Amino acid sequence: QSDFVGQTVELGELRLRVRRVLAEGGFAFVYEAQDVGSGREYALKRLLSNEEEKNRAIIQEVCFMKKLSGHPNIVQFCSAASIGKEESDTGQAEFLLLTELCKGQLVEFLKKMESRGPLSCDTVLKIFYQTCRAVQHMHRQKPPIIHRDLKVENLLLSNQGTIKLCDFGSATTISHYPDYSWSAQRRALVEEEITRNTTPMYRTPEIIDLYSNFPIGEKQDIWALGCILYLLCFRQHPFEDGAKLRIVNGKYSIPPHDTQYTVFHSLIRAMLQVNPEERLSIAEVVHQLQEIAAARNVNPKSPITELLEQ
Amino acid sequence: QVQLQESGGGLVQPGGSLRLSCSASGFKFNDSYMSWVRRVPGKGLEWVAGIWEDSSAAHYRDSVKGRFTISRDNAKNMLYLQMSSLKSDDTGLYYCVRRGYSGDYRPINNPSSQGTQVTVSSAAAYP
Ligand SMILES: O=C1Nc2ccccc2/C1=C1/Nc2ccccc2/C1=N\OCC[C@@H](O)CO
CATH class of the missing domain: 1.10.510.10 (Transferase(Phosphotransferase) domain 1)
Known part of the structure; x- marks a missing residue:
C-alpha cells in the first residue's frame, strides 16, 4: 500500500507515476498520480481484495461513477482497471480507479x-x-x-x-x-x-x-x-x-x-x-x-x- | 518556508524572445516537478510548461509547443523558460510553481510569488 509510491501504473495510453498517498480508508488507498508524457495530475484509488462480494460492489460503484461523471459536482471519472488474483503481486484481485485530482x-x-x-x-x-x-x-x-x-x-x-x-x-x-x-x-x-x-x-x-x-x-x-x-x-x-x-x-x-x-x-x-x-x-x-x-x-x-x- | 522569485519578463515585440528565471528555496527542489504558469487578465491562471524533477520529461500546453523550452538547474535550484516566436496571447504574469496541472491546463498550486510581467507589444516604453 505505502510501498505502491514510486510505481509507474499503466491505464490505457496513460503512464501514471504514483507520487504520494492522499488517503487510507480500510481496504482502499488514494494516491496523487501524474502522467509522465503529459504532466497531468490525477487521483488514483487502489483496492486490494480477493472477496467476490467486494469485487461485485466495486463493479457497481464504478458503474455509478461512469454514469454520473460529467456533472460539475461529481468527481470526474478518467479510467479504471481490474487486475486478476494471479495477475497481481499481492496475490489479491487489484482494483484501480483514476479520477480528477481534488485539492x-x-x-x-x-x-x-x-x-x-x-x-x-x-x-x-x-x-x-x-x-x-x-x-x-x-x-x-x-x-x-x-x-x-x-x-x-x-x-x-x-x-x-x-x-x-x-x-x-x-x-x-x-x-x-x-x-x-x-x-x-x-x-x-x-x-x-x-x-x-x-x-x-x-x-x-x-x-x-x-x-x-x-x-x-x-x-x-x-x-x-x-x-x-x-x-x-x-x-x-x-x-x-x-x-x-x-x-x-x-x-x-x-x-x-x-x-x-x-x-x-x-x-x-x-x-x-x-x-x-x-x-x-x-x-x-x-x-x-x-x-x-x-x-x-x-x-x-x-x-x-x-x-x-x- | 517555500520561496519562489521570478525574473526576465519585459516588453518585447511580437515574434520576439525572452528568458524567464525562477529561484527556489524552502523545499527539496531536486525532487519536485516544477511548472511555469501565467495569469492573464480576463482569463485567470493557465499552466504553460512543466518539467520532471530529474529533467527526463518536459511538458507543454499545445499553444506554446515548438516555441517554448522549460529547463532546470538542480545544482543552483533554478527554473528557466526559453520563450521564442512570441504572440500577444503570451502576454501575462508568469510564475513558477511546484507540481503539474489538472484537467484543462489548471495548475494544482496557485502562485504565492510576485511573478514577472511578459508584454508582447511594439510600444516604445511601458504605458
Ligand atoms: O482527489 C483527491 N484529492 C485528495 C486530497 C486529499 C485527500 C483525498 C483526495 C482525493 C480523492 N479523490 C478521489 C476520487 C475517488 C474516490 C476518492 C477520492 C479521494 N479521496 O477520498 C478520501 C475521502 C473519501 O474516502 C471519503 O469517502
Missing part, C-alpha cells in the same frame, strides 16, 4: 475555518447548493441513484474550489415500500443491509422503524442533506448522539437565539421531516437554494474561495 477533503477545509469563527451564509449556501446539485444529478438518473451515505466526510473540494462527491459505495437503485404483507424476516434482512451502508447519526426514521409503512427511497438523501445544512450552520450534527429515539421522533432544535442562518431555518425544518413523503424533493431544495442565492446576488455554482485561500 482535499471538505472536512479538512472546515477544520481550518473554525479558528476564524462561524462560516458566512454565502459560504454555506455554495457548499450546500453544490452538494444538492450532485444529489439532484443522481436522483435524475433512470433509474434514480440513492446515495444513502451523504455527509461532509464524502465531500471533496475541486481544483476550482467547487464541491465534489467522490464515494458511491453505499449508493443503490433499490427502493423499498414496506407493507402489511412483510414478514419479520424480510424487515430484519432489509434493516441489516441498510445499517452496513449508513453513518449511525445520519440513519433515517424509515430505516430505524421498519413497522411504519414509510417508503425507503430517494427521500433518504433529503434527511441526510437536512443534517448537513444544520451541521454547516451550527457547530454540531442535529442528532450527533446517534439516539434512535431522537431520530425516529424528529427531536432536534434550531438554536433558539441564532440571527445568522435564519434564511436556511425553513429548509432545515422541511428536509428533516420524520415521514419521507412529507419531505422536500431534491428539485424543491435546489429551487429554494436558487431563490436564496438570487435575493443575495450570489452565483451558488461559484468557487468557495473563502475555504481555498487559507
Whole structure:
C-alpha cells in the first residue's frame, strides 16, 4: 500500500507515476498520480481484495461513477482497471480507479475555518447548493441513484474550489415500500443491509422503524442533506448522539437565539421531516437554494474561495 | 518556508524572445516537478510548461509547443523558460510553481510569488 509510491501504473495510453498517498480508508488507498508524457495530475484509488462480494460492489460503484461523471459536482471519472488474483503481486484481485485530482477533503477545509469563527451564509449556501446539485444529478438518473451515505466526510473540494462527491459505495437503485404483507424476516434482512451502508447519526426514521409503512427511497438523501445544512450552520450534527429515539421522533432544535442562518431555518425544518413523503424533493431544495442565492446576488455554482485561500 | 522569485519578463515585440528565471528555496527542489504558469487578465491562471524533477520529461500546453523550452538547474535550484516566436496571447504574469496541472491546463498550486510581467507589444516604453 505505502510501498505502491514510486510505481509507474499503466491505464490505457496513460503512464501514471504514483507520487504520494492522499488517503487510507480500510481496504482502499488514494494516491496523487501524474502522467509522465503529459504532466497531468490525477487521483488514483487502489483496492486490494480477493472477496467476490467486494469485487461485485466495486463493479457497481464504478458503474455509478461512469454514469454520473460529467456533472460539475461529481468527481470526474478518467479510467479504471481490474487486475486478476494471479495477475497481481499481492496475490489479491487489484482494483484501480483514476479520477480528477481534488485539492482535499471538505472536512479538512472546515477544520481550518473554525479558528476564524462561524462560516458566512454565502459560504454555506455554495457548499450546500453544490452538494444538492450532485444529489439532484443522481436522483435524475433512470433509474434514480440513492446515495444513502451523504455527509461532509464524502465531500471533496475541486481544483476550482467547487464541491465534489467522490464515494458511491453505499449508493443503490433499490427502493423499498414496506407493507402489511412483510414478514419479520424480510424487515430484519432489509434493516441489516441498510445499517452496513449508513453513518449511525445520519440513519433515517424509515430505516430505524421498519413497522411504519414509510417508503425507503430517494427521500433518504433529503434527511441526510437536512443534517448537513444544520451541521454547516451550527457547530454540531442535529442528532450527533446517534439516539434512535431522537431520530425516529424528529427531536432536534434550531438554536433558539441564532440571527445568522435564519434564511436556511425553513429548509432545515422541511428536509428533516420524520415521514419521507412529507419531505422536500431534491428539485424543491435546489429551487429554494436558487431563490436564496438570487435575493443575495450570489452565483451558488461559484468557487468557495473563502475555504481555498487559507 | 517555500520561496519562489521570478525574473526576465519585459516588453518585447511580437515574434520576439525572452528568458524567464525562477529561484527556489524552502523545499527539496531536486525532487519536485516544477511548472511555469501565467495569469492573464480576463482569463485567470493557465499552466504553460512543466518539467520532471530529474529533467527526463518536459511538458507543454499545445499553444506554446515548438516555441517554448522549460529547463532546470538542480545544482543552483533554478527554473528557466526559453520563450521564442512570441504572440500577444503570451502576454501575462508568469510564475513558477511546484507540481503539474489538472484537467484543462489548471495548475494544482496557485502562485504565492510576485511573478514577472511578459508584454508582447511594439510600444516604445511601458504605458
Ligand atoms: O482527489 C483527491 N484529492 C485528495 C486530497 C486529499 C485527500 C483525498 C483526495 C482525493 C480523492 N479523490 C478521489 C476520487 C475517488 C474516490 C476518492 C477520492 C479521494 N479521496 O477520498 C478520501 C475521502 C473519501 O474516502 C471519503 O469517502
